[PDB]
Amino acid sequence: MDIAIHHPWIRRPFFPFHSPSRLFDQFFGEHLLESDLFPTSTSLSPFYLRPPSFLRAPSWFDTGLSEMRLEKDRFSVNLDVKHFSPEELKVKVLGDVIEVHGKHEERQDEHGFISREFHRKYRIPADVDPLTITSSLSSDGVLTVNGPRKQVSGPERTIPITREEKPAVTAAPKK
Amino acid sequence: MDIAIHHPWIRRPFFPFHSPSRLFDQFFGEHLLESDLFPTSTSLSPFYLRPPSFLRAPSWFDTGLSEMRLEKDRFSVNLDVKHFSPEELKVKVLGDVIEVHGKHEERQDEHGFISREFHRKYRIPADVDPLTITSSLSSDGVLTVNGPRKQVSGPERTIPITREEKPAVTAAPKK
Amino acid sequence: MDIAIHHPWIRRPFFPFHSPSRLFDQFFGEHLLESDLFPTSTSLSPFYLRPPSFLRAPS
Amino acid sequence: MDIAIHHPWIRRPFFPFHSPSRLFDQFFGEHLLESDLFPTSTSLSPFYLRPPSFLRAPSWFDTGLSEMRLEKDRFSVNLDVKHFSPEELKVKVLGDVIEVHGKHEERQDEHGFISREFHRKYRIPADVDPLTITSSLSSDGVLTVNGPRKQVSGPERTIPITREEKPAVTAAPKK
Amino acid sequence: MDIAIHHPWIRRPFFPFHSPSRLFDQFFGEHLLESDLFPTSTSLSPFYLRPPSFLRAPS
Amino acid sequence: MDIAIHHPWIRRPFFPFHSPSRLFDQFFGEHLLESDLFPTSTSLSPFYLRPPSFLRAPSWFDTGLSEMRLEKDRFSVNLDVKHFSPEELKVKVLGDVIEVHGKHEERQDEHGFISREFHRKYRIPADVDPLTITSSLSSDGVLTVNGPRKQVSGPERTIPITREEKPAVTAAPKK
Amino acid sequence: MDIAIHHPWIRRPFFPFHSPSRLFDQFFGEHLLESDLFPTSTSLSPFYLRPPSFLRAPSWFDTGLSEMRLEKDRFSVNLDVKHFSPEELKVKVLGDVIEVHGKHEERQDEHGFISREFHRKYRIPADVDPLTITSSLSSDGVLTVNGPRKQVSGPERTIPITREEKPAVTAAPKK
Amino acid sequence: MDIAIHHPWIRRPFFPFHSPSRLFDQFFGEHLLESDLFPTSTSLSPFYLRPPSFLRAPSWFDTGLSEMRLEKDRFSVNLDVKHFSPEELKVKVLGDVIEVHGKHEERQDEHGFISREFHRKYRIPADVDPLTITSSLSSDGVLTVNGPRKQVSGPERTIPITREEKPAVTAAPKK
Amino acid sequence: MDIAIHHPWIRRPFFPFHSPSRLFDQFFGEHLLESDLFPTSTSLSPFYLRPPSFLRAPSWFDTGLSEMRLEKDRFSVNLDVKHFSPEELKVKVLGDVIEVHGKHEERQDEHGFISREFHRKYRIPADVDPLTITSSLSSDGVLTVNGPRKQVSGPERTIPITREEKPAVTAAPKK
Amino acid sequence: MDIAIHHPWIRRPFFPFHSPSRLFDQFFGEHLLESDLFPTSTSLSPFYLRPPSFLRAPSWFDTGLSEMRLEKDRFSVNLDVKHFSPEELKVKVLGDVIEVHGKHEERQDEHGFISREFHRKYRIPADVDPLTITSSLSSDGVLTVNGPRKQVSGPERTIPITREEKPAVTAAPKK
Amino acid sequence: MDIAIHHPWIRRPFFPFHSPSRLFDQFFGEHLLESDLFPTSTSLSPFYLRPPSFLRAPSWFDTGLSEMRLEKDRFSVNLDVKHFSPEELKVKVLGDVIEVHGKHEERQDEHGFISREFHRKYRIPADVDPLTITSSLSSDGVLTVNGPRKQVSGPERTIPITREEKPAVTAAPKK
Amino acid sequence: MDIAIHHPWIRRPFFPFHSPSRLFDQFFGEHLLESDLFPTSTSLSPFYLRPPSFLRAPSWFDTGLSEMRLEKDRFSVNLDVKHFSPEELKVKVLGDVIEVHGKHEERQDEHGFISREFHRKYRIPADVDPLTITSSLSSDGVLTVNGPRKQVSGPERTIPITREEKPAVTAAPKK
Amino acid sequence: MDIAIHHPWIRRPFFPFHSPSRLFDQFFGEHLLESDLFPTSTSLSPFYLRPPSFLRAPSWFDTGLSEMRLEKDRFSVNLDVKHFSPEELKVKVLGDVIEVHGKHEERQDEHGFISREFHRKYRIPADVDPLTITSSLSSDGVLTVNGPRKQVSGPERTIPITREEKPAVTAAPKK
């Protein structure tokens, strides 16, 4: 880690960014928490956060967009099952997530039987809607989930519970 | 004091109170020091301090009152001296503090004499006034301090001295 | 009464803002006193007296 | 320095000087950096820094003046070379710094020759101007640099390079 | 010249606000420079020149 | 926990109890274990532990009566289910513990359905007997367990195992 | 003290006195405390502490006697004041303690005066009774505290107060 | 010797034997020392010690017996000397210990002579008696110690000296 | 303290003085103690200590003089009591030390009375002799101590006791 | 050891002896070594060492005398052998040391024979001279060594050998 | 280094030299510094120092002599240059040090040229004298420095500057 | 660098690469040193080193090639000097390295003159040959180094010196 | 032993000798152990060991020779006894080692007799043969051991025994 080299060297390509408030994570964090309460006369915002930029003319905002949808239209997605496995396949439409589980034994040996399995994991919200999206199987294994689309999803785990005004705790000297 | 338990636990029922300014003792301390100089446009204040409260409708202030007076009238307080001690008793009215010191030997043994003593300590400002408050003794020891009242007292020791405009010191490296 | 434990542990959190005088709660209190007793931002309102002094320039 | 004596004693005569903002070097440093950019509505300053003073009537500002010029006139400064050294002297006018280097052997011994040397270092900006200031030598060594003046100089090393705009650096955990 | 005493003792009080670059007195100074030379709050105050450059979009 | 204060102070209001056998937990523990084997001509006691008391006239014994039953008679206990949930409630009589689990959705929103639930935990041994104790439900949710009573219960976990005459182990030096 | 020498050596002659109960100070201490409560059919004794002795025929008991009285009769006693100091002497009979304080200036110099002083401290309870012991002075300084006698005294400081049945304290984990 | 495993495990099959007095080596040691002084109305005992046994019907006593004698008669023990060594053998009857030392050179080489030796160590007390036990040698080396017997022996080194009541030692504080 | 800088530097302007006997404090201390016993044919000194000097022609001796007397004659000293305080002033002539303690209340407030006090401490030996020096007070407070003078004083605390030929102590190894 | 007590206390009754040269063991050791070479102009001295004494009038010298001779005359010392042991006694005259070794069995038991022994160790140089001193035994065991005397002896072990002018060793840095 | 072996051993063949004054380097150093000032009544001395010797008859003095000159006469030293290098050689007579620097390429390869060089360093003061000593070269490289002689030289670096009477410098406590 | 994570994780993908000889750097280093001496029966090798590869059919060898030359022909390389600097430019052909140093002041200010400089560093061995490669300058600054080519270069610092077979050293125990 | 100097320096003149197998003591030790079993077609060797030499033409082998014999013939060695001691001399021929022990008192004093002794230790195997070598003494002490010779000897202690094929031990984890 060379604290005598990496520390002073790393702090080199950072001067022109320096002076960003020793408590940048809390300073801006408060301003972002204020605009997350009520539409503060802005051009609205799902979660746009005003970050420290060098752009003098335009005002940049931290956004997503390219993390929800991209290139879709109005067709039918098709899963992949190279070898037919009708009775040995299970298609599951768990929300905006289309998956296929097909296992078929095509390779055989003396006393050992080989079994191939194709499992697709599709997390296409803008292409899937459990309510309408159906499934159609072929005789070769070609699975095809047909139906409309338009939607956004994505299972995350960001739910900080607790802290809700009016608590209070206490302690005392010990040894 | 399990630092790996009491620390996160003592900070648990404190969340709804958290974010009270890491320097709460100095932040509010300054605002209270500003209103302690000149009677700022308020309902005045002997020492009312605006504290952080969850009350939304009303504005709470840190007060005293219940630490000065309570339930008193014309009155004529009475000291306690179960057994008479006319010559062996001394009543002292030191300010708003009425005290009685009476010692009488009522129990006797072979070569050992027992002496009982009754000492009362009354810190009743709203009941005593050195000037008018007098004392009347009975033949049974029943002492009675009669007289008007109305006033507050309480001997404390809170007088920070020095830090009297423009001082300055200096130092230098050593080892 | 942990003089060799609490004492050096209580003066530790003070370091982030420790270095000046030993007393920080009176100069600021008097500096604000002479500044709060003076019509600042708003209007005014005084009241005083004057006893004998040796000072010629001030009073 | 007994930390149990000097510490509480070096902070004592500091009593009413305290409360100068724990971050005084940065707080005022920012205000001085702001007035160092654009000529802010003031009586104009080269580097006047509004410092914390006890003066109530007048406003004090950190200034120089007594570190550039003082008492000068037409003049015609003259270096010092007690003993003549026409061929053994070199006068150098390096900017606002006039110097003389003359060495002459006046003392002689058996097999040892003594040599005297006179070296003057004049840093008079308000008395020297390399362009006009000339030099006139006498037969006794009396050097005389004649000419006009009016100027300020002084070699210092205060040029903190780096710390431009938009850099960006990073790191990562280690062990 | 206590390099093994003062050096690690002077960089200690900086930690409460230490982490970014080693140069913190010029980006904030230039950022304020480009913001102070611009009529903020008040209005007007210019004067400049223009030499040959390779830049086409800017100048 | 100032060992130089709490130790000599905590050892203060304990003098009058002091000298209670440095091995009080084992001394009396043996005498209590002897009377726990065979009714030792006592007034019969499940666990009357003769403790050290200051009572000179009467002999005190550690009891437990006030931890089994108290104010009961011959009626029916009523569970709590303010809102009816006939099909959505399940009453369970697990020994001397009567519980009710009823959940009904009475509050409705746009796309969110609220469901309230009432769960009672009754550990009344002197009021319950799995055999006779039945359950009757009302149309409002008022559950009522009817039947006689008289019994004592309470799930604990105090069952030391092993240590049964004739074991023997051994060891040897190491490094 | 060489732990590898003094320890095994100082524990050598101790053999014939060894095996004296590891808790000898408490074991015998209890038996001595039992006989200090009520005259336990003993030959009556203020503090006859039965100690471990090698005497097989007789039973030894720890006692005083030779620390209270010895050789006295009727007496008259005589203090010591070599040089007369009638007005400069003070005889004090503080209980069973007779003392004399006489100071007289017999030696003289130029500007320095010498003063000799004789101070006697008599702790004779067996021959002193403040109630009947008087004092007679001679013209030479010879003091004589005549009077009857027979008594015992001696100021000690062995009064272990506190601890007196029924106290109780407690504590809890710490860190 | 994992203290976190061997300690709790080596104490596992020890419970049914535990509770044997933390000072078992001294407790019983005293009772065995009391019966070692005078025949305490027992069936006598060379050194029979009453040990803690689970036997309920019979009383076990720690004894020897099988460490002194066993299977013998008139007898006439024979030493072993495979090869004759009349002049090169020495029989020694040191108490109840019969030994034979015979060395004869039977193997020969070029310039190296081999010498075999037979040494027997017989500690047979119940077979030997210095007085009567004699020795008879054969021409082949067969040694034969003939004679009666009946007696027990065995050289040990258990003789604790010193410690004899009366004497003692003392010490003082230092460091 | 920079042991690697201050040590070799503080030992820089010390060379030309170095080599003053590693035991200078004791070496010269003995020679000064020898001349402090009997007038050693010197010009009679009270405490003139011959110190090491660079003076080659004259012999320097450490002396006082300028620490006893200086500029006096034959007059009267005047104490300071700006405001009259006859009854509230106390002049004390404690040896060669003249002091004045006068306190008078000249400033008055509502319920607060101000009291000024003037206290002078004169340690003039060659200006005051308690035997003849008197005091004269004026109606304005001007105190004037009149009388002759000539004498030296000055309270110090340099009296090393003990150490007086023929003592002797001892010790022994420990651990 | 109480370094904070014994050190300053063991140095208390030592002052009047202090200043005995920090190197007293070597300083005087040299002067004693000088007078041990050649009979320096003195009243001679076997080993009289002039020590530091407080005696002002006389000069003290450390000597022996009372460690060689004492009270003897034309004698005939006699050893002690209470019980006769003519054949069981051995008298040895090893220089100025007369010893007797007599052992006789006078006490008899069943199978145990007791043997008493008398051993005398006489180190009388001024009473013994191996050359003339003889021995005479009596019938009761009374041994008597008769003969002249006058002599001094005493086996010691103080003989330093090494060191003898002209050696020289060396070394060098290591690590 | 075996401190428990080399220390007592390296001090073995050193005893006969021991006692050479613990401060031998300073004791004699002072006596040598005294004789280095003024030519003290002796057979003079360039730097002869009286050292501790075992020689009883003669007095030894530490001297040089065999470190300046030795065996020389009317000479004409010759430098060494096996192969001629007239244009490629440079003779230098720097004081009493004669040197020769000649480099000639005599060995040649394909594309690599070898160059041999002969460099002599003569520090002969008793053979060289910059003035007269000249140089003569031969056609084979044989250099010859001819001329008289007689002189002593030798560049050393023993010039301890500083310390020159009357400096003055001090310090103070720290922490 | 979590030793408890990175260590076992970094050796994880190393799984199928393990068993590469603990001393791989020396083992192969010897085989490569053997083929670096004499052209061992192979397709020769400039420095090809047979490394451990998974290739079964072909034999791989560590080589360079792509670190010397690449795409060249006849050529006439051109240096870069945007603005003419005939007199202010210096072309240097240091071996296979062609460089150009031209500085011209084209930008001018009030009292500040700007000077631009173009410096090219060409390390083209297969394009340069000091001998033939010349240089031509244009009036605009366009420099052009014309001439043939074909060559390889590259200044590195890999020359291990010394180990001149037949040395030897020694040491000894120390501390 | 500066590990930062001696380590890298003592490894410099080792450079050209390095790389002699990190396990040279065992590698060659094995090859020498193989040739020490059976005459491995060598030119027959007693203990010739092939060492790593730089000799390219000849093969060097570690040998003795110059440690057994040297320059002898027929001889008749003579011992040394300067002064005759016929009765006081003892010649011993212990193998190939001839020694003489003669002590005679030739110097006499007052009461002290001096005795000189001559002891010779000859370890000449190639000159002595205990079987034939005899001894002849002269009247002056000149001893002469005459006889043939030819033989080699020398007492050493190099006999590492045990390692009796088929051993093995075992252990186990502990703590």
PDB file of C-alpha atoms in Angstrom, chain K residues 20-167:
ATOM      1  CA  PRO K  20      45.812   2.620  33.553  1.00  0.00           C
ATOM      2  CA  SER K  21      43.481   5.355  34.788  1.00  0.00           C
ATOM      3  CA  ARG K  22      39.831   4.941  33.773  1.00  0.00           C
ATOM      4  CA  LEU K  23      40.332   8.258  31.995  1.00  0.00           C
ATOM      5  CA  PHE K  24      43.670   7.481  30.341  1.00  0.00           C
ATOM      6  CA  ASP K  25      42.626   9.095  27.049  1.00  0.00           C
ATOM      7  CA  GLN K  26      42.070  12.425  28.824  1.00  0.00           C
ATOM      8  CA  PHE K  27      44.658  12.277  31.615  1.00  0.00           C
ATOM      9  CA  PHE K  28      47.656  11.798  29.333  1.00  0.00           C
ATOM     10  CA  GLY K  29      45.864  13.818  26.671  1.00  0.00           C
ATOM     11  CA  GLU K  30      46.197  16.853  28.924  1.00  0.00           C
ATOM     12  CA  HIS K  31      49.896  16.305  29.618  1.00  0.00           C
ATOM     13  CA  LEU K  32      50.515  15.938  25.884  1.00  0.00           C
ATOM     14  CA  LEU K  33      48.544  19.109  25.221  1.00  0.00           C
ATOM     15  CA  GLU K  34      50.705  20.972  27.734  1.00  0.00           C
ATOM     16  CA  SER K  35      53.950  19.937  26.045  1.00  0.00           C
ATOM     17  CA  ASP K  36      52.423  20.818  22.675  1.00  0.00           C
ATOM     18  CA  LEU K  37      52.103  24.490  23.611  1.00  0.00           C
ATOM     19  CA  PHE K  38      55.557  25.639  24.704  1.00  0.00           C
ATOM     20  CA  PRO K  39      58.802  23.635  24.134  1.00  0.00           C
ATOM     21  CA  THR K  40      58.922  22.301  27.692  1.00  0.00           C
ATOM     22  CA  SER K  41      62.386  21.520  29.088  1.00  0.00           C
ATOM     23  CA  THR K  42      62.916  18.291  27.151  1.00  0.00           C
ATOM     24  CA  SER K  43      64.854  16.934  24.190  1.00  0.00           C
ATOM     25  CA  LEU K  44      62.158  18.709  22.195  1.00  0.00           C
ATOM     26  CA  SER K  45      59.451  16.760  20.396  1.00  0.00           C
ATOM     27  CA  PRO K  46      57.683  17.016  17.020  1.00  0.00           C
ATOM     28  CA  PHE K  47      54.907  15.128  18.772  1.00  0.00           C
ATOM     29  CA  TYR K  48      56.656  12.736  21.176  1.00  0.00           C
ATOM     30  CA  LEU K  49      54.168  11.556  23.792  1.00  0.00           C
ATOM     31  CA  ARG K  50      55.198   9.927  27.088  1.00  0.00           C
ATOM     32  CA  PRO K  51      53.253   6.614  27.110  1.00  0.00           C
ATOM     33  CA  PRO K  52      52.842   4.056  29.947  1.00  0.00           C
ATOM     34  CA  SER K  53      55.601   1.484  29.477  1.00  0.00           C
ATOM     35  CA  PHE K  54      57.068  -1.365  31.510  1.00  0.00           C
ATOM     36  CA  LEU K  55      60.593  -0.226  30.666  1.00  0.00           C
ATOM     37  CA  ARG K  56      62.269   0.702  33.950  1.00  0.00           C
ATOM     38  CA  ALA K  57      65.712   1.835  32.791  1.00  0.00           C
ATOM     39  CA  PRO K  58      64.856   3.884  29.634  1.00  0.00           C
ATOM     40  CA  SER K  59      62.059   6.380  28.982  1.00  0.00           C
ATOM     41  CA  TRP K  60      60.020   5.606  25.862  1.00  0.00           C
ATOM     42  CA  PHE K  61      58.314   8.266  23.736  1.00  0.00           C
ATOM     43  CA  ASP K  62      55.720   7.712  20.990  1.00  0.00           C
ATOM     44  CA  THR K  63      57.337   8.900  17.757  1.00  0.00           C
ATOM     45  CA  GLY K  64      57.115   8.724  13.978  1.00  0.00           C
ATOM     46  CA  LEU K  65      60.339   8.846  11.934  1.00  0.00           C
ATOM     47  CA  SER K  66      59.626   5.583  10.085  1.00  0.00           C
ATOM     48  CA  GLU K  67      56.624   7.282   8.455  1.00  0.00           C
ATOM     49  CA  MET K  68      58.303  10.157   6.602  1.00  0.00           C
ATOM     50  CA  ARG K  69      61.477   9.040   4.812  1.00  0.00           C
ATOM     51  CA  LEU K  70      63.798   6.016   4.830  1.00  0.00           C
ATOM     52  CA  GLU K  71      66.364   5.035   2.169  1.00  0.00           C
ATOM     53  CA  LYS K  72      67.104   7.772  -0.383  1.00  0.00           C
ATOM     54  CA  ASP K  73      70.059   9.568  -2.033  1.00  0.00           C
ATOM     55  CA  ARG K  74      70.911  11.700  -5.110  1.00  0.00           C
ATOM     56  CA  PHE K  75      68.192  10.175  -7.253  1.00  0.00           C
ATOM     57  CA  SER K  76      66.281  10.189 -10.500  1.00  0.00           C
ATOM     58  CA  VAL K  77      63.141   8.068 -10.030  1.00  0.00           C
ATOM     59  CA  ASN K  78      61.631   6.341 -13.070  1.00  0.00           C
ATOM     60  CA  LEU K  79      57.924   6.020 -13.836  1.00  0.00           C
ATOM     61  CA  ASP K  80      56.501   2.922 -15.527  1.00  0.00           C
ATOM     62  CA  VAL K  81      55.049   2.931 -19.032  1.00  0.00           C
ATOM     63  CA  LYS K  82      55.839  -0.435 -20.633  1.00  0.00           C
ATOM     64  CA  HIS K  83      54.507   0.708 -24.008  1.00  0.00           C
ATOM     65  CA  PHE K  84      55.285   4.103 -25.522  1.00  0.00           C
ATOM     66  CA  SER K  85      52.571   6.753 -25.357  1.00  0.00           C
ATOM     67  CA  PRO K  86      54.370  10.107 -26.006  1.00  0.00           C
ATOM     68  CA  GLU K  87      51.236  11.951 -27.110  1.00  0.00           C
ATOM     69  CA  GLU K  88      48.946   9.812 -24.954  1.00  0.00           C
ATOM     70  CA  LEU K  89      50.754  10.354 -21.638  1.00  0.00           C
ATOM     71  CA  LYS K  90      50.514  13.164 -19.098  1.00  0.00           C
ATOM     72  CA  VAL K  91      52.981  13.447 -16.225  1.00  0.00           C
ATOM     73  CA  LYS K  92      51.864  15.449 -13.199  1.00  0.00           C
ATOM     74  CA  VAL K  93      54.007  16.719 -10.340  1.00  0.00           C
ATOM     75  CA  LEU K  94      51.432  17.662  -7.713  1.00  0.00           C
ATOM     76  CA  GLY K  95      53.625  18.566  -4.765  1.00  0.00           C
ATOM     77  CA  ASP K  96      55.545  15.642  -3.309  1.00  0.00           C
ATOM     78  CA  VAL K  97      53.401  13.288  -5.383  1.00  0.00           C
ATOM     79  CA  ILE K  98      54.656  12.173  -8.798  1.00  0.00           C
ATOM     80  CA  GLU K  99      52.115  10.498 -11.074  1.00  0.00           C
ATOM     81  CA  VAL K 100      52.028   9.284 -14.668  1.00  0.00           C
ATOM     82  CA  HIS K 101      48.974   8.755 -16.870  1.00  0.00           C
ATOM     83  CA  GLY K 102      49.690   6.999 -20.151  1.00  0.00           C
ATOM     84  CA  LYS K 103      47.173   5.116 -22.277  1.00  0.00           C
ATOM     85  CA  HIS K 104      47.994   3.438 -25.588  1.00  0.00           C
ATOM     86  CA  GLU K 105      45.972   1.115 -27.808  1.00  0.00           C
ATOM     87  CA  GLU K 106      48.298  -1.763 -28.684  1.00  0.00           C
ATOM     88  CA  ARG K 107      45.755  -4.586 -28.945  1.00  0.00           C
ATOM     89  CA  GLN K 108      43.259  -4.554 -31.814  1.00  0.00           C
ATOM     90  CA  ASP K 109      40.302  -6.768 -32.731  1.00  0.00           C
ATOM     91  CA  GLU K 110      37.604  -6.903 -35.422  1.00  0.00           C
ATOM     92  CA  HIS K 111      35.453  -3.947 -34.355  1.00  0.00           C
ATOM     93  CA  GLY K 112      36.864  -3.638 -30.860  1.00  0.00           C
ATOM     94  CA  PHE K 113      39.999  -1.721 -29.945  1.00  0.00           C
ATOM     95  CA  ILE K 114      41.823  -2.543 -26.721  1.00  0.00           C
ATOM     96  CA  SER K 115      43.642   0.198 -24.825  1.00  0.00           C
ATOM     97  CA  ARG K 116      46.125  -0.450 -22.030  1.00  0.00           C
ATOM     98  CA  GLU K 117      46.944   2.188 -19.421  1.00  0.00           C
ATOM     99  CA  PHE K 118      49.751   2.565 -16.893  1.00  0.00           C
ATOM    100  CA  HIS K 119      49.174   4.783 -13.861  1.00  0.00           C
ATOM    101  CA  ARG K 120      51.800   5.265 -11.157  1.00  0.00           C
ATOM    102  CA  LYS K 121      51.208   6.998  -7.830  1.00  0.00           C
ATOM    103  CA  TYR K 122      54.410   8.056  -6.085  1.00  0.00           C
ATOM    104  CA  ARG K 123      54.140   9.781  -2.718  1.00  0.00           C
ATOM    105  CA  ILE K 124      57.874  10.275  -2.206  1.00  0.00           C
ATOM    106  CA  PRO K 125      58.483  13.579  -0.342  1.00  0.00           C
ATOM    107  CA  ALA K 126      62.100  12.708   0.458  1.00  0.00           C
ATOM    108  CA  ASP K 127      62.643  12.177  -3.269  1.00  0.00           C
ATOM    109  CA  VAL K 128      60.528  14.903  -4.846  1.00  0.00           C
ATOM    110  CA  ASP K 129      60.490  18.690  -4.829  1.00  0.00           C
ATOM    111  CA  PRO K 130      57.993  20.288  -7.296  1.00  0.00           C
ATOM    112  CA  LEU K 131      60.483  23.041  -8.162  1.00  0.00           C
ATOM    113  CA  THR K 132      63.558  21.109  -9.300  1.00  0.00           C
ATOM    114  CA  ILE K 133      62.077  17.655  -9.993  1.00  0.00           C
ATOM    115  CA  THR K 134      61.583  17.457 -13.754  1.00  0.00           C
ATOM    116  CA  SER K 135      60.602  14.685 -16.167  1.00  0.00           C
ATOM    117  CA  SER K 136      62.264  12.934 -19.104  1.00  0.00           C
ATOM    118  CA  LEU K 137      60.460  10.544 -21.451  1.00  0.00           C
ATOM    119  CA  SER K 138      61.974   7.752 -23.532  1.00  0.00           C
ATOM    120  CA  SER K 139      60.843   6.275 -26.855  1.00  0.00           C
ATOM    121  CA  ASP K 140      59.697   3.063 -25.161  1.00  0.00           C
ATOM    122  CA  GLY K 141      57.635   4.849 -22.529  1.00  0.00           C
ATOM    123  CA  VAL K 142      60.283   4.772 -19.820  1.00  0.00           C
ATOM    124  CA  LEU K 143      59.579   7.964 -17.885  1.00  0.00           C
ATOM    125  CA  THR K 144      62.270   9.338 -15.579  1.00  0.00           C
ATOM    126  CA  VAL K 145      61.806  12.118 -13.034  1.00  0.00           C
ATOM    127  CA  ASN K 146      65.272  13.486 -12.268  1.00  0.00           C
ATOM    128  CA  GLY K 147      66.375  16.015  -9.669  1.00  0.00           C
ATOM    129  CA  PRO K 148      67.579  16.383  -6.028  1.00  0.00           C
ATOM    130  CA  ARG K 149      65.363  15.633  -3.016  1.00  0.00           C
ATOM    131  CA  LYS K 150      64.882  15.971   0.767  1.00  0.00           C
ATOM    132  CA  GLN K 151      61.381  16.786   2.021  1.00  0.00           C
ATOM    133  CA  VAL K 152      58.434  15.402   3.994  1.00  0.00           C
ATOM    134  CA  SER K 153      54.738  15.380   3.126  1.00  0.00           C
ATOM    135  CA  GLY K 154      51.516  13.447   3.614  1.00  0.00           C
ATOM    136  CA  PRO K 155      47.917  14.709   3.123  1.00  0.00           C
ATOM    137  CA  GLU K 156      45.888  14.129   6.290  1.00  0.00           C
ATOM    138  CA  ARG K 157      42.571  15.486   7.566  1.00  0.00           C
ATOM    139  CA  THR K 158      43.078  16.286  11.246  1.00  0.00           C
ATOM    140  CA  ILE K 159      41.982  19.893  11.722  1.00  0.00           C
ATOM    141  CA  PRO K 160      39.567  20.161  14.699  1.00  0.00           C
ATOM    142  CA  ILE K 161      38.169  23.684  14.463  1.00  0.00           C
ATOM    143  CA  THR K 162      35.869  25.487  16.922  1.00  0.00           C
ATOM    144  CA  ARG K 163      36.142  26.063  20.686  1.00  0.00           C
ATOM    145  CA  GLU K 164      38.065  29.233  21.179  1.00  0.00           C
ATOM    146  CA  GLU K 165      37.544  30.633  24.702  1.00  0.00           C
ATOM    147  CA  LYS K 166      34.407  32.546  25.822  1.00  0.00           C
ATOM    148  CA  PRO K 167      31.308  31.192  23.925  1.00  0.00           C
TER     149      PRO K 167
END
